[PDB]
Design a protein around this ligand. Structure first.
Ligand code: U5P
Ligand code: U5P
Ligand code: U5P
Ligand code: U5P
Ligand code: U5P
Lengths: 348, 348, 348, 348, 348
């Protein structure tokens, strides 16, 4: 007895779809789902997706409510579709994937990932669910996460954090650290050695190393002195330069965090999705310095220092590829006379 | 178990709601309901009501598919709601009544007409359905139709025609002639003597008496002579006067029918609902004669002749009351020197 | 360079997309596309699909404007997608296929049908377009039409009619008769022997054999006598029985055509798509006889006579399979004492 | 001269409907009302209700702007409709009641509450308005609030707080403490002895007793020691248990307030309306502990202590009914060996 | 190659329209623009204007991204339209002006401001753009801003602050202080001597003089003593009176700022646009004091003191006109016995 009214019954009574029997009366108006409570309509769901309102509602109700990989990781690994779950993209307020497998009769392309239609697609498999490791072994294309070893398969250790109901966190009551595995055209594929972004935000930014603690606490000249960063242009890249009409540098989230605590600024997120590199149209409220495309990455400051200090500074300009969140991020490196002028990640 | 997808299943497989088990995939977009058939969306219902699309869809699917009284009759008798059915108003493409009894969870005010909330409402009961005659005997306010006698109740003979799936017809394979009964505050009413409108349309107008055959076949002066109608202004009232910029008369549907077969004209139906008197903004294509409010009634011509020949003609102008379709219709009667000048029904 | 404004320019100047350079100003509102002509907005396209309005507009403008197979034929042959064209489904006012190849950036899954993603799909190829016969020879799954012989392939002769801009016709100035070929998993199929429906309509029904001329001209008993059809229940199946509240029979379009020219009736097309068998909720205006699901097929009368005269009549009821428009249509055959009682196609 | 343009004139000039004469030009687009100011459109109202945009606008403009009972109190007392005012529900951004009396021609069921249609409805009456106490005495069903005694009527003292323009507050410049009276089927009905919720929110939470001050200030073990709460499971019920994947307890708002000041968490309000018990899908950001249905009530901590300490702890599990905000709230009581395991309110 | 897809390419790649070549696929659904990124739709723009979605998107993408005059200044100077730019109104989330010149083919009334259609309109010209000073000299009606002197033209020094991407700021890395010039019917027009509002907001309010520092820091009686404000009713006008049900005074933003830091309140901005005087429906959360129309102006406190101390206090009531932001603001002045009772700006 699968139906719109049953999905709404579960939302009202269990907070999400829980397979319980029951029905409530529902009204659909434009892109919103309502239910009647004691004679009046109460909004249950406002559709912000490009799917029909009643379909989006069901996929949202059926969203995965355990820690799952952040969407940027799944995108970077080429995931097209999930096996028997919905990965909800809270940055876009929409399903991470257009089609489903065994979830919803309007969006399903199959009931099980073993069906031939799924073979060309990179299917996401969750080893925490019974049977899905074995489905991955039979799939032609897929990405698998597990909490432990899988016999014979060589793992890649994933990021420490995961997404739980749209909250990115490092789990203490739950496990958010997964092993990752990937298959392409029937062959298990070695995942590259990689850095991971830290998935923090401006307001609640917390340092995760003594170097980041020092960066937030010390003055610019003292931090650069203590960590021996002369000639690496941190004044520009990390602290940002607000003296000209065009804003200089400011490409590390921690540097935005330091500035924000002292002086507010505006960030227009003109491509609002989850991605390893984020691009903002930034306007500094105190000075009027601004920049249309300011690429910002949230690396651990120790990792960025490691990355920049390993570069050859003898070329005027080159593109440097660094593996981050399993993808190749291009950095622009500008040097003059053996010193860095700038070093910044580019719009993906 | 009631459900949007089950309603759609019945529409696709049975043509309407038939209580069958099953489900089909449904999409709701732009006030329209779609179902997926072999990978593509097929429109099942476009909402033209002021109700939510999924609610209107369910009421439409649950519409009564037997011959039922035309909505104008039910309105004239003061019907507020129907017992355990939906009277679909095909002139408005919407339910004839705002609420339901035992039909739909979003619109129901009760499951049975015996509930207290129904006592003050005038409930429509259908004697063809088992138990409904006795429900009428117990109800405080109600209208009852039957096909035959009811013990201890005097009937009022209704019109010959009824509505079947939006087609108004005099039934030959099905009975469309009902007895009518009405109760107000527990008291059986004596319904008034009444004429009935004939519910015909322009393009397929069919005469229903020898006088109407003669009207369509004969020239104007031949007809007026044969039925001795000199001095009743039929030339104006029934045939129409297209000689001046304002169109004179033309208040009987048969007169429009006669003109239409020879010469086309435009009728703007600016209040599009079912009613005993209809008002049109008429523009005559041949002459350019037009009129903003032309009230038009489809009485059998013999009945209209009886009415106008039964009036006193000694006063310049007065209001004449005629019970038609059980309601009192006001006509304006204008006379000069003992003859009719015009006689027309008024917008109710 | 593809563009909304360039699509509109072609529609305004060429009647459809013709690859011409230019732009016009465009407004998008209420699922409708407008263009500005001398200071006022003129509607160019109203979206009736479940796609975004600007995407539906582009696919409509790029529709195939040569004679093409009717959508029911393509559906019956399992076609999923078209090579480098859009088959517009005029019954649904929408694209016949969800995805495209080399047509439109929002809906394309590939630029050429040789890409790997197309291998499992049944691709429609048009031998009138240069190169497409050879694309079919290399494709894994496909349907091919041609106007003449293809070296080394046995053809299946298709119907006489095809669809040109939504008009189904037997071409006189253009060829509408195609050879058909089909491949499944790289293997050329032998297409089955099949009847074809005639794709006619009620108001303009034209007989296509002497038997059909006789059916329309002669009275019922004269016709049944002349073609010796006693005992095949044509009175019920083809002519229809309007004597009871439920309408009996009336399963052949020619029988509806004959009734319609004498007496009007209403057909509610409750699944409005192109299909070999059509299902209507029918209400006869003269009698009030009606039926919720009346399955109707337009076979040449001679073909229907051959089919029913080729059945064993010794069992009360059974399912009869008839290949029509390349698909297996199930008919219900009911018999009594060695004669037909009824014989009707089922909702597919 | 009541009209859309006059309602907008009052909104623009007086901040709400004030019965002033005048008109401004208005544009309606989708669900939004605009007015022209110096050549450009300015948004006056965005419709979030299920009513037509222009109707919702008028009811909003006509909202009651004096302190009124919170909607949860009116709901708990069975109020269906208000006499000659609109109680705006700021939690739902919509009218608290679907119909009106003497407010708006699209929603009125009557002009005065004495009309027979209002007799079955529980009408809300405001003794601050001239004549409404006497209307309550004549009403068959109703709820009355006053600021002082009504002769012969036995009062119930209401909550200290009321809602003023969506701000819940205990009035100092205005009176927010009302006497309550209720009638059912013509008979005055004794309102039950009741606790009241405190209607506070997480961010601005202020303690209202020394015990609440101590709870916010002291550590868990010290507070439980000082107020002798051993064996009543406050560690679970009030402080919450974040050590397992499922979040334990956390059912009092003050406990959420204490946690929030130290560590943020996410509350999905999946039924967003005013109610005595609120239910949240909660995710703790620090630990990853979460729970789909966490029922939360804002009682004065002294009241909850009084409630739980009066319970019999000798049964493994029972349902305990407590009157709160005039309604029966069900609590689940789990005990083991004479101590509380948990005690929590259930989803209404 | 100007098109919807090209506008979207620029937004995605450059943060705004930058005249770059390229295209991305775009979906329009209701009032929102999406683009496809790696198989899924990402929202680029939600239309809150009364223009068609695709037009509003292009004007937004083409918005001026240098410091520009606040919209209230342009409105006060009678500006109808801008020369070859779009002034985006971030308070209304819409273009400041309905038509354009050389921006967008759907909204342009001309390509250049020299065209005859522009002569009756007050065109905004930006002396920072090559050629626009000379266009102003040739225009019949216009407003010009420059950073420096224009030969022979007598300047008006504008406000210190300007709007950069919706951020109002006094520029340090950029110039926000302009000279202003205006022409009416071909004649340069002397701009009046004027005060300027300070364009601050409640949360981030920063004092801009020692008097404002003292007002925020000192107690009411001490501030009034130090600055000799006895008899000017500052207790009412600036500090506000919260003792009665109607809120008294509170007409200077700095006084709202002082109250807000101590006790929160609600401001309903019922005409949400940029204007020299703002009007709020205010509800004080601590007391319940409220007022439907509370007019609030953000003058430097020193300027307001200068204004009020120059008034003649010998009349019971008069209207006082003060030039502010180049417009005449009407103040109500009430006096009794040579002292101010109140002095407040009126709804523009
Ligand atoms: O993808 C990009 C392109 C540019 N920039 C910023 O914009 C500046 C100027 O870019 P360009 O004009 O040299 O391309 C760069 O130095 C850098 O700060 C980014 O952050 N990301
Ligand atoms: O309800 C109305 C009012 C007017 N008329 C037509 O309009 C003419 C002029 O009406 P009046 O302008 O004299 O009211 C009438 O003679 C009659 O033909 C109607 O048909 N119905
Ligand atoms: O798919 C169907 C089912 C039924 N019928 C019509 O409805 C009658 C009654 O069907 P049933 O109620 O016996 O299934 C049949 O004899 C036939 O005329 C159809 O045309 N198509
Ligand atoms: O209406 C409900 C149901 C459950 N719970 C919480 O969920 C836990 C587990 O519920 P159940 O799985 O025992 O029903 C309860 O102990 C309680 O913390 C609520 O807060 N409210
Ligand atoms: O445009 C207006 C009108 C009134 N008021 C406030 O409302 C009070 C009462 O206004 P009235 O009822 O005297 O018009 C005024 O003293 C003033 O505080 C304003 O702020 N702005």
């Amino acid at each position: 007895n699968m139906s719109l009214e049953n999905v709404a019954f579960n939302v009202v009574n269990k907070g999400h779809f829980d397979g319980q029997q029951g029905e409530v009366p529902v009204s659909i108006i434009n892109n919103t789902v309502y239910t009647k409570v004691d004679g009046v309509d109460v909004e249950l769901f406002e559709n912000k997706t490009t799917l029909p309102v009643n379909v989006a509602f069901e996929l949202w109700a059926k969203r995965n409510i355990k820690p799952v990989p952040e969407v940027k990781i799944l995108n970077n690994l080429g995931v097209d579709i999930a096996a028997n779950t919905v990965i909800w993209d809270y940055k876009r307020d929409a399903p991470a994937h257009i089609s489903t497998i065994g979830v919803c009769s309007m969006t399903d392309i199959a009931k099980k990932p073993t069906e031939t239609i799924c073979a060309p697609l990179t299917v996401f498999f969750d080893g925490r669910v019974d049977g899905q490791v074995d489905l991955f072994r039979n799939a032609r294309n897929g990405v698998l996460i597990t909490e432990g070893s899988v016999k014979g398969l060589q793992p890649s250790v994933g990021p420490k954090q995961a997404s739980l109901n749209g909250v990115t966190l490092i789990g203490e009551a739950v496990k958010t650290q997964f092993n990752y595995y990937k298959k392409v055209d029937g062959v298990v594929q070695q995942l590259p050695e990689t850095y991971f972004t830290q998935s923090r935000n401006l307001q609640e930014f917390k340092p995760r190393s003594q170097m980041e603690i020092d960066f937030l606490e010390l003055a610019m000249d003292e931090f650069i002195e203590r960590y021996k960063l002369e000639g690496y242009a941190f004044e520009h890249i990390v602290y940002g330069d607000f003296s000209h009409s065009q804003l200089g540098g400011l490409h590390l989230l921690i540097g935005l965090a330091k500035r924000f605590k002292e002086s507010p600024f505006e960030l227009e997120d003109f491509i609002p999705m989850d991605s390893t590199v984020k691009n903002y149209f930034i306007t500094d409220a105190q000075t009027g310095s601004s920049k249309c495309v300011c690429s910002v990455i949230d690396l651990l400051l120790d990792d960025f220092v490691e990355i920049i200090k390993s570069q050859d500074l003898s070329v005027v300009s080159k593109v440097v590829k660094v593996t981050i969140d399993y993808t190749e991020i291009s950095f622009m490196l500008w040097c003059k006379d053996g010193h860095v002028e700038t070093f910044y990640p580019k719009l993906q």
